Design a protein around this ligand. Structure first.
Ligand SMILES: CCCCCCCCOCCOCCOCCOCCO
Ligand SMILES: CCCCCCCCOCCOCCOCCOCCO
Ligand SMILES: CCCCCCCCOCCOCCOCCOCCO
Ligand SMILES: CCCCCCCCOCCOCCOCCOCCO
Ligand SMILES: [Mg+2]
Ligand SMILES: [Mg+2]
Ligand SMILES: [Mg+2]
Ligand code: NA
Ligand code: NA
Ligand code: NA
Ligand code: NA
Ligand code: NA
Ligand code: NA
Ligand code: NA
Ligand code: NA
Ligand code: NA
Ligand code: NA
Ligand code: NA
Ligand code: NA
Lengths: 331, 331, 331
């Protein structure tokens, strides 16, 4: 089976970095082509009862700020087995249990700069899509409770260049119109800024869908990092979204924030970020949507790593607003 | 739906750069594999009259002078909408209206070193296939007149690294056995050789296909560029082709040339290129062709840009002749 | 048609390089995803009797020690023609006749570090998968005898950076349960270590499949190299595998070795490698296999090239053992 998500966002950005030429370079109108094509299949082996599953998914073919061209396997690409009793196991490149909740619902619409890869903690707060991963997905026990658990090699280890690794777990419980979400991830042996780090990240959240057309989500996220020289860091964060759906339309407000980072008990000032976002979406077909989106990113003002050099954050390139229209079509 | 052009040229080149070791490296037999796989489709949205269209086309999988392997999205890759009243609008990565006519008919057979990316003018005479583009293609009004128009982001703007942009327009009129072609492209905020450039390129052409088996194309291209320091540059060029088609055979002579560049009113000597090409093509199948081809490229002898450094042209590597056989098949 | 091999090997390696941090870096658990997607087809041209053939095969989507993503055209990618009287001719990226026998059977299971790309001779003992190649595959004359022959450009020449080339031939003869194999490859104008090299490799080998469930292979490989400064080098090598297949199971022991390199008649001590490997395989489906594998790599201890610099070998990263399980599925 060939599948695909055809997705195209025309997005205008207006940057306020403090440098006008940089604002000219980063800002302006671009096309964010997140179209991808993938291949997947099942096969029932004659001599093995768990059903074989597999997927090979290409990357974004032309994202904004990037060149054309994606290879096959850049996104979720795996093999596995699935049973009605124990759910499914996947080996390969997949989303960590924590990141899947960070990405959805908590990064939509355009909150990712702050809540996905945003933040200021050292080490690696969590992986997102990670290769060299084994991931178990429980079935939805009693149609209300499921578990996601995974471990895998780190980024450096996947190149034979390190021994970083990570493990994570997430749970979901359905309670009436609500879903409750909790997740953990632990990153070990993370090499950065001349230190070896350990990261621990905890997430709790809630999601609601109501028959009057309101739906919403709220998430709290707590990140701790410990470096080998004794330094401890802490940063937490939140994301929330409110939606109203009526006929063929969805109205959505979203907000997400990282709070000031605390190093060794001391709060580093102006190390917070937040983003406010408004979106109108049109259900143009059961297989497609049209959307318009406007958002505002106010980033942190800078921070040094443990090597006395500037640590990179999603605010390094400066504050910016964004206006966009987009289409996404699934097949 | 999956489509493809299976394209294979076995090409022998004999260079004459003036350095025998460089002739040895650059010359010799190679296999130019321009085979490409693509994906496309349409979708009539329930709630939108213009039909949704999309395409994702992979690159040349193993061209000569390049390593193996191509990603999806390297060639024309877009979304868009179409309607019989107002035509087609495409967003993503497409051919500029000007470049399309430069490429076909005027670059065939093997005239592209001179007429396509050949030239000496500064800035960017035109884009060829460009991401971050919106392109309107009109219906063929009265089955005779159509309009291609496009604006897009520049090469550097595509990476958040600059603020270049461009706009282009082309028109075609069918008149008996003739087609009349005209095209403009203007490139802006082009950063090169220490300056910011504006380019203006104009093209006029004719094509004819006659019942006696003769067909032909002839084009004139006018390139002007102006630099931020006041320097003005001008270069013009021609391409022409003559075909005789009898039964399953087509014989073809092509010729193209860039004439001497003029900078601030003064002609720069020996800045011209020309190419003379001969080809025989066999219609081996309604879906495929075989061909043999020989061509002479005599390039310019060098020029400097406005940074007092050598400006790269397609002649930088030296003159060369080329004899080749090829196969193209379409599905 | 779309076809694929879905291949996943979870491999744990334990290195003994003599550097504990390198051992931690190179070793540990990885996922080796060699899943690959391809496209192939034939076409009967209306005006040409030999059937047109073509294939475009993608790379490994996520191999161990490598990043995710592969393009189309990274594995066997070609056009060609086939007729019954004379076999098939392919043009493009294919395996050389010598390499095809090195790889299968003589590299399985996991012998490749030693027998495939392993070794210490200078220049280029042979290509493996090579672009810019023309390869003829004879039919099986008298239902017992076939021939493979090929000529191609070199690694450098396919980028326009040299004039290396190569040619190769192989022959197979069926003798009851046996197949006899022989092959030759010659490489020319190989530029390495300040010299230009000529390589000559010869291979003889036997495969047998007996109805008792016993099968085996045994190969002897002889490698000669001549540098432009007069230096001669010689190294030979061996690969053997023993298999017992009963029911849905295949047991396998393999062994391969490169022996000490001789330079100008003098044996260079400790320039040998060998590998011993055991494997159990389960025919889980007519389309798929599960396997478990353990192997031990004992690599050479270093040598200099003719430029007084260390010559890279598959032992440069140091000795290692490896334990793994895998699935391969074909569609
Ligand atoms: C002697 C310099 C140019 C020689 C070749 C000119 C060919 C132009 O004719 C093409 C017209 O159609
Ligand atoms: C190169 C000589 C190898 C031949 C020895 C084996 C003979 C096997 O014959 C099979 C009977 O049919
Ligand atoms: C024609 C069959 C060749 C048999 C392979 C011989 C095994 C190599 O041993 C060489 C050891 O040195
Ligand atoms: C029917 C008896 C099979 C004979 C065994 C094969 C001989 C193996 O060596 C032959 C190649 O050397
Ligand atoms: Mg990662
Ligand atoms: Mg461009
Ligand atoms: Mg090679
Ligand atoms: Na810009
Ligand atoms: Na892009
Ligand atoms: Na799950
Ligand atoms: Na060459
Ligand atoms: Na190539
Ligand atoms: Na048009
Ligand atoms: Na060890
Ligand atoms: Na490691
Ligand atoms: Na990998
Ligand atoms: Na063969
Ligand atoms: Na020894
Ligand atoms: Na060793």
């Amino acid at each position: 089976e060939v599948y695909g998500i055809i997705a195209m966002q025309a997005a205008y950005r207006d940057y306020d970095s403090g440098d006008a030429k940089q604002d000219d370079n980063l800002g302006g109108m671009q096309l964010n082509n997140e179209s991808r094509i993938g291949f997947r299949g099942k096969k029932q082996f004659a001599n093995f009862e768990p059903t074989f599953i597999w997927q090979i998914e290409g990357g974004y073919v032309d994202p904004s700020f990037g060149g054309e061209g994606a290879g096959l396997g850049e996104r979720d690409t795996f093999v596995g087995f699935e049973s009605a009793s124990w759910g499914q196991v996947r080996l390969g490149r997949v989303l960590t249990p924590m990141y899947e909740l960070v990405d959805w619902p908590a990064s939509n619409p355009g909150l990712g700069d702050v809540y996905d890869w945003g933040g200021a903690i050292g080490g690696a707060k969590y992986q997102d899509r990670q290769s060299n991963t084994i991931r178990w997905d429980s079935p939805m026990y009693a149609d209300k409770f499921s578990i996601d658990a995974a471990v895998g090699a780190g980024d450096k280890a996947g190149l034979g260049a390190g021994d970083d690794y990570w493990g994570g777990i997430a749970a979901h419980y359905k309670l009436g119109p609500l879903q409750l979400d909790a997740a953990y991830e632990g990153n070990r042996n993370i090499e950065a800024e001349g230190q070896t780090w350990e990261n621990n990240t905890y997430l709790v959240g809630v999601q609601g869908w109501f028959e009057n057309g309101i739906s919403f989500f709220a998430q709290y996220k707590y990140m701790e990092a410990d470096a080998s020289n004794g330094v401890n860091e802490k940063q937490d964060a939140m994301s929330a979204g409110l939606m109203y759906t009526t006929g063929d339309w969805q109205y959505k407000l979203g907000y997400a924030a990282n709070f000031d980072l605390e190093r060794d008990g001391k709060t580093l000032s102006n190390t917070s970020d937040d983003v406010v976002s408004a979106q109108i979406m049109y259900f143009v077909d059961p297989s497609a949507v049209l959307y318009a989106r406007a958002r505002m990113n106010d980033f942190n003002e800078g921070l040094d790593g443990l090597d006395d050099a500037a640590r990179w954050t999603s605010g390094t390139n400066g504050d910016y607003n964004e206006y966009s229209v987009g289409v996404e079509y699934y097949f």
